[PDB]
Amino acid sequence: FVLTEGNPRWEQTHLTYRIENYTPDLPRADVDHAIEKAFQLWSNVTPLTFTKVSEGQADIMISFVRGDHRDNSPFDGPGGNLAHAFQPGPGIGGDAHFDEDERWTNNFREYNLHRVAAHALGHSLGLSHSTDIGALMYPSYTFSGDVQLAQDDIDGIQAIYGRSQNPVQPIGPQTPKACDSKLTFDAITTIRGEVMFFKDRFYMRTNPFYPEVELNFISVFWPQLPNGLEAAYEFADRDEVRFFKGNKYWAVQGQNVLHGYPKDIYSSFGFPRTVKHIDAALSEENTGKTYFFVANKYWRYDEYKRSMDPGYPKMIAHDFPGIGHKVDAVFMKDGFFYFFHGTRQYKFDPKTKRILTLQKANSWFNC
Ligand SMILES: [Ca+2]
Ligand SMILES: [Ca+2]
Ligand SMILES: [Ca+2]
Ligand SMILES: [Ca+2]
Ligand SMILES: [Zn+2]
Ligand SMILES: [Zn+2]
């Protein structure tokens, strides 16, 4: 996080805010809701409170304006700058302006008022742009269908006003770092020559032949998917990639969730209704066998037969000597299975049912 130069800060802890005019793009109700919830994100992690007023001046004056609109920060029509807010302070201080030749929404369509307002109000309280890609204050517009403060945002805002008067203290997701040797993965899959690691709302993509890591929201590519993947694998045969969460599984082609999916695992792969979820999955280069891992047991399914194999609720620790009895993630590369469990990574050889290397979970990255 980065605190606005000069460290402007509101002196009162009980602030007032007013919505001057309303955008035509939405019903007043929807605008009101967006703003309210935007303020709440901030009041949840600090002692500050925001009260909506109707008449008269307020600390934070909110408005929808078009082009040059009386303040020296002219808007640029459709596109470009969506909004801007001023530092805490008297007058125009703390005010937020949304550019009206923007198409404010309440859905996944660009640009969602709640999301942009949550960000603007940040500047309204004294925060500047963060260099943390996962932070709400980051300079951009991403939409993971659920606006929330990243741990970085909380630290930034608490540094100016103190922490929540909550006895528990809210927390926010932390952005994974590739050079942290404490890194662990929710799931991993290969895709058109690259390896794609998943962790919370993020993903880390790499081509092992030229180590250079790409970090970003899973929603940048597949907005439909629910954040919190548990397993995943590629099936280049159909050029798809399947993700598992809960007990249903989404399939994807290119950058769009295929028709109908999600779908049930039981009806799609044939798995006893006993299995709640899944821990990890991989598919053999060109053998047609796909291995799914649950708990300490594993199962095999034949793609070219839309069906499992004769009695397969077998043991992990037994047929995969060395990796232990629980898989966090796994993917295949050049004939070897790469198993992940916590920060541990075992390079397993299918042929010799042998373990060649035992590395750190993030060993692939350049650190
Ligand atoms: Ca604009
Ligand atoms: Ca003001
Ligand atoms: Ca508009
Ligand atoms: Ca997992
Ligand atoms: Zn303005
Ligand atoms: Zn900003």
Author numbering: 81 to 447
Text from the published report:
Matrix metalloproteinase 1 (MMP-1) plays a pivotal role in degradation of interstitial collagen types I, II, and III. Under normal physiological conditions, MMP activity can be regulated at various stages: during transcription, proteolytic processing of their inactive pro forms, zymogens, as well as by inhibition of enzyme activity by endogenous inhibitors such as tissue inhibitors of metalloproteinases or TIMPs. These enzymes have a similar domain structure: an N-terminal signal sequence to target for secretion, a pro-peptide domain to maintain latency, a catalytic domain containing the catalytic zinc, a linker region, and a C-terminal four-bladed propeller structure called the hemopexin domain. The collagenases cleave the triple-helical collagen approximately three-quarters away from the N terminus of the substrate, resulting in three-quarters and one quarter length fragments that are unstable at body temperature and undergo denaturation, rendering them susceptible to other non-specific tissue proteinases. The proteolytic activity of the enzyme resides in the catalytic domain but it requires the hemopexin domain in order to cleave the three chains of the triple-helical collagen.
It must be mentioned here that the present structure is an active site mutant where the catalytic glutamate residue has been mutated to an alanine. The structure comprises of the N-terminal catalytic domain, the linker region and the C-terminal hemopexin domain. The active site zinc is bound in the sequence HELGHXXGXXH by the three His residues: His199, His203, His209 and a water molecule at the active site cleft. The present structure on the other hand stands unique in being elucidated in the absence of an inhibitor. This is the first unliganded structure of the full-length MMP-1 where a water molecule is seen at the active site providing the fourth ligand for the catalytic zinc in the tetrahedral coordination sphere. Also observed in this domain is the salt bridge between the ammonium group of the N-terminal, Phe81 and the carboxylate group of the side-chain of Asp232. The catalytic domain of MMP-1 also contains three calcium-binding sites. In essence, the hemopexin-like domain undergoes a major displacement towards the catalytic domain, thus widening the cleft between the proteinase domain and the hemopexin-like domain on the active site face of the enzyme. This altered configuration makes the active site residues and the RWTNNFREY (residues 183–191) interface, a segment critical for collagenolysis, more accessible for native collagen.
